[PDB]
Amino acid sequence: MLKKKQLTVLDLHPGAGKTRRVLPEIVREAIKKRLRTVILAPTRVVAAEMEEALRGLPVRYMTTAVNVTHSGTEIVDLMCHATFTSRLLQPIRVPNYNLNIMDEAHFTDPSSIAARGYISTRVEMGEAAAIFMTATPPGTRDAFPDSNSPIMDTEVEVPERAWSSGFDWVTDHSGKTVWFVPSVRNGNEIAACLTKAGKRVIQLSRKTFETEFQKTKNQEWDFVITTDISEMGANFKADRVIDSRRCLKPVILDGERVILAGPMPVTHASAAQRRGRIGRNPNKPGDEYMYGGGCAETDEGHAHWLEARMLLDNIYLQDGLIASLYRPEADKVAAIEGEFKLRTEQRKTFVELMKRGDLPVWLAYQVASAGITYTDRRWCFDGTTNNTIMEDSVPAEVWTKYGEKRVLKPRWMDARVCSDHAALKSFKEFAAGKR
């Protein structure tokens, strides 16, 4: 696996031991061969689980999620998928790793797709080896893979709103349930309905993941209501998964705006990962998987693959060459390699709008390519009337950095800046010049 010019896909079924059993063996072999190695974790929670599996091995943990006193002689680095891509983009020297290991390599966030593109190109060039660890590689058509113990799979109508009757099976259950919803707002309504019925509910989403995930260990719960973030190695002690089989899809319209389309069917990879949360204990057969719709290839035309191209066009590889997306996911976007390449100063603005501004990739690109500087927020207020952002059925308003009350009306509308109360609050702070 570790020899140059080779990319290996380690596709053992969910719960087969890729992280706890296979990963330490690969690391020992890499250290024995003096291979400068990088291990890429999707989240800070997975990074913490990896430190437990690799305890006693000389690994440099480039994350504050782990508290370790490094020796300074480690040749193995561990960091998140987003940190790797961020460091490549910035004027920071990233070693050219001989071995690149990506855990939960199915992650479809733009920074993860970009990391796969960069690593696979280095391998194609004959410069590095790579191991992608996932039960569901890109393009998988099997939503029902093998598991540690048998699962009861049931196609059933799943509520997506509060209900009064017709879904007794949901609340009549006495075990623990992990329920995947298409959005934070949809999970809020189902959570409220379950709480009113006497259930103890925890909610998880990208922004709250590390903090709220700890509650799944620290307190008794009946339900976990989660978005698709829990498809990336988050493990639970549960006996049932309820899966709406739906997700939101960011779509770029006429290259001028981003909408959150759907809810629409999840990919087979996502469904297999959601189901994969249960059937993990070989001594507990009969875990349930209730699913409320079919699968479709909704990653085709999904904005994340276009956003991965914007990131890869701005990463130095060799002279004017640009890394391609990983071959099995390369047809998900129609893009000219190099079309998003920015000049030095615009690239710096693009990076800062993402890193400090916390803006979606697409939106950060529109601002930086228009020649606007990071602190210039006039674009948050000079868009067309149809770009007015609404809050509680009335236009959102902020005090500008000049002390003037203005309606939020960005020149470029990206629905992810107001997909929920938390996102809109963060965007309002940005428009006001507060970060």
Ligand X SMILES: CC1(C)OC(=O)c2cc(Br)c(O)cc2O1
Stretch that binds ligand X, among 61-69, 287-295, 381-389, 427-435 (CB under 6 A): 61-69
DSSP state of 173: -
Give the residue with the Cβ less far from ligand X, 62 or 252. Answer: 62
Element (H, E) at 76: strand 76-80
Judge contact between 95 and 51, C-beta under 8 A: no
Judge contact between 389 and 395, C-beta under 8 A: yes
Judge contact between 53 and 116, C-beta under 8 A: no
Our finding on whether 62 is near ligand X (CB under 6 A) is yes
- Number of residue whose CB is nearest ligand X: 62
Which residue carries 């009064």 as its tokens? 164
Q: How far is the CB of 349 from ligand X (least distance, A)?
A: 21
User: What angle do the packed helices 209-218 and 44-53 form, to 10 degrees?
Assistant: 50
**Distance linking the first and last C-alpha atoms of the chain:** 45
Contacts of 16 (CB under 8 A, 6+ apart): 135, 148
Q: How far is the CB of 61 from ligand X (least distance, A)?
A: 6
Q: How far apart are CA 417 and CA 364, in angstroms?
A: 11
Give the residue with the Cβ less far from ligand X, 67 or 386. Answer: 67
Q: How far is the CB of 66 from ligand X (least distance, A)?
A: 8
User: Which of 84, 89, 122 shows the shortest CA–CA distance to 105?
Assistant: 84
- For ligand X (CB under 6 A), the number of binding residues is 6
Our finding on whether 44 is near ligand X (CB under 6 A) is no
Residues annotated as binding site for ATP? 12-19
Judge contact between 393 and 235, C-beta under 8 A: no
Peptide bond into 263 cis (omega under 30): yes
Q: Which of 19, 37, 43, 83 touches ligand X by CB under 6 A? A: 83
User: What angle do the packed helices 361-369 and 303-313 form, to 10 degrees?
Assistant: 50
Give the residue with the Cβ less far from ligand X, 85 or 177. Answer: 85
Stretch that binds ligand X, among 56-64, 104-112, 161-169, 246-254 (CB under 6 A): 56-64
Our finding on whether 64 is near ligand X (CB under 6 A) is yes
Give the residue with the Cβ less far from ligand X, 64 or 165. Answer: 64
Contacts of 300 (CB under 8 A, 6+ apart): 331, 332
Instruction: Please state, in angstroms and as integers, the Cα–Cα distance from residue 217 to each residue in 194, 220, 234, 270, 341, following that order.
Output: 20, 8, 12, 24, 45
Q: How far is the CB of 246 from ligand X (least distance, A)?
A: 34
Stretch that binds ligand X, among 62-70, 118-126, 157-165, 346-354 (CB under 6 A): 62-70
Our finding on whether 60 is near ligand X (CB under 6 A) is yes
Our finding on whether 111 is near ligand X (CB under 6 A) is no
Our finding on whether 43 is near ligand X (CB under 6 A) is no
Q: How far apart are CA 127 and CA 111, in angstroms?
A: 22
Stretch that binds ligand X, among 55-63, 177-185, 319-327, 366-374 (CB under 6 A): 55-63
Give the residue with the Cβ less far from ligand X, 46 or 135. Answer: 46
Q: How far is the CB of 1 from ligand X (least distance, A)?
A: 26
Our finding on whether 171 is near ligand X (CB under 6 A) is no
Judge contact between 53 and 24, C-beta under 8 A: yes
Give the residue with the Cβ less far from ligand X, 60 or 207. Answer: 60
Stretch that binds ligand X, among 59-67, 102-110, 219-227, 412-420 (CB under 6 A): 59-67
Q: Which of 31, 57, 63, 251 touches ligand X by CB under 6 A? A: 63
Residues engaged in binding ligand X (CB under 6 A): 60, 62-64, 70, 83
